[PDB]
């Protein structure tokens, strides 16, 4: 006897990855960038820049 036409279903699950990277900033240079330790001199401005 003939074969009836066949039907089939299939599913694929997701795959999960991630990416990352570090950005560590120094200990003497953010409060010139945060302006806390900034003192008013013609020398510290250049260092903040």
């Amino acid at each position: 006897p003939a074969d009836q036409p066949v039907h089939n279903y299939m599913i694929k699950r997701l795959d999960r990855r991630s990416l990352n990277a570090a950005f560590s900033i120094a200990v003497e240079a953010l409060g010139l960038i945060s302006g806390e330790n900034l003192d008013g001199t013609h020398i510290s401005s250049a260092m903040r820049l």
Partner: protein, 49 residues
Amino acid sequence: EKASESYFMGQMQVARTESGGGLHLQLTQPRANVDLGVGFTAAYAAAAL
């Protein structure tokens, strides 16, 4: 092939933590993927040695 892969990028975000004195900013990005074709859609040949 023309489209051998389905790819989803999540949303970037920052997670930060203090160590090594300074600040340690840590970028992350969750991302997922899953093939988009019945049967194999990629192969290699190993040409040289």
